[PDB]
């Protein structure tokens, strides 16, 4: 059954809702994001229209091989028309072709729908300034102070500057990063430029790149793994058993790995630096997991709201306990009292 902030009142709309069968008079599907958690029931077999940005439309297509006739791909920034209502799509910072979603409604009501998006201000020079918003469907991830983590610059920094020593002192270091979906390959193509060889990675995962409209990328990826000192793993590899293994193929071309393990937020966040950052090792393999979010952090999502100043807050993540639910509302209100909207 397919939850309530996952219908747009007063429209046949839904968002992120495909794992539901079909639902009852919704003529049109909007999917904000290519990550599972979101497509989850999208196939071959869907037979309705998918609304979307044009990234995620050449996923749909070429991974999970939605027939084109139901993929509907719409330019961002742009007023466009969706069963007689106007729809715009807003670059959601998230991972690639990740969209916002801001309805109008008949009635003159508006709706944003965030999907998942790491707040920035640069939101705030969008076709939302000066935009009154009704309603705002909120990505709550990390909705609550604790929920600290640098800047994206700042890791890629990191990473640019670990790699770079590890591989300068060491030409015989081989640099892995692992990754489970879409999103936050500024990790490996910043380290693979800075120590200029392409990555190497799956057909798979090449395949995957290949649908993000990335400028230059057939000079940046590679499925020719030993011509590379970057290489991609599956998340679940990047271990020190998984990555012995990785070390004995290519045979005997190099003698360290050092590996890359982007997560989002972690309890050592309130607690450490990025710049104090510390690998676990053994032998000749380290691991460096980095704190990058693609997602708000508290102070992100507290600034775009307070900007925004919404009428009515509906959140989208964590909303599976009472605790979770009502603290996520004291928090709106803080903010609602502090800003005076
Ligand atoms: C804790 C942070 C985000 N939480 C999350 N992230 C992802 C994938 C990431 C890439 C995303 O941004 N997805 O939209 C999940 C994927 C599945 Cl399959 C199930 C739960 C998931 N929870
Ligand atoms: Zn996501
Ligand atoms: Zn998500």
């Not at 006739?69 to 998230?94: F, M, R, S, W």
């Not at 709706?111 to 920035?120: E, K, M, N, P, S």
């Not at 015989?172 to 392409?198: N, Q, R």
């Not at 709201?305 to 009502?326: D, E, F, Y």
């Amino acid at each position: 059954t397919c939850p309530f902030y996952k219908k747009i009142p007063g429209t046949g709309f839904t968002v992120d809702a495909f794992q539901y069968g079909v639902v009852e008079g919704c003529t049109a599907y909007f999917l904000t994001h290519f990550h599972s958690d979101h497509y989850a029931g999208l196939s071959k077999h869907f037979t309705f229209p998918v609304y979307c940005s044009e990234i995620t439309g050449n996923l749909l297509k070429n991974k999970l091989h939605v027939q084109e006739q139901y993929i509907h791909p719409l330019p961002l920034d742009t007023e466009c028309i969706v069963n007689g209502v106007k729809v715009v799509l807003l670059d959601a910072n998230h991972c690639p072709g990740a969209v916002m979603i801001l309805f109008y409604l008949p009635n003159g009501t508006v709706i944003l729908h965030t999907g998942d998006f790491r707040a920035d201000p640069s939101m705030e020079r969008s076709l939302l300034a000066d935009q009154k918003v009704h309603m705002l469907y909120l990505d709550t991830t990390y909705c609550s102070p604790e929920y600290t983590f640098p800047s994206q610059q700042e890791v890629i920094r990191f990473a640019i500057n670990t790699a770079f020593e590890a591989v300068t002192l060491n030409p015989h270091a081989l640099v892995v990063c692992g990754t489970y979906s879409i999103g936050k390959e500024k990790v490996f193509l910043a380290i693979a430029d800075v120590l200029g060889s392409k990555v190497g990675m799956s057909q798979e995962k090449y395949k995957t790149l290949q649908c993000l409209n990335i400028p230059e990328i057939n000079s940046l990826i590679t499925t020719d793994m030993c011509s590379s000192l970057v290489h991609l793993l599956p998340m679940m590899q990047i271990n020190f058993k998984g990555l012995q293994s990785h070390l004995k193929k290519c045979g005997g071309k190099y003698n360290q790995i050092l590996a890359f393990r982007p997560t989002g937020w972690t309890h050592s966040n309130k607690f450490t630096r990025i710049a104090d950052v510390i690998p676990q090792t053994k032998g000749n393999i380290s691991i460096y997991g980095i704190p990058y979010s693609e997602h708000s952090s508290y102070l992100e999502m507290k600034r775009f709201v307070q900007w925004l100043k919404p009428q009515k807050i509906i959140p989208t993540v964590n909303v599976g306990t009472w605790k979770s639910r009502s603290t996520m509302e004291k928090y709106f209100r803080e903010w609602k009292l502090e800003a005076g909207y």
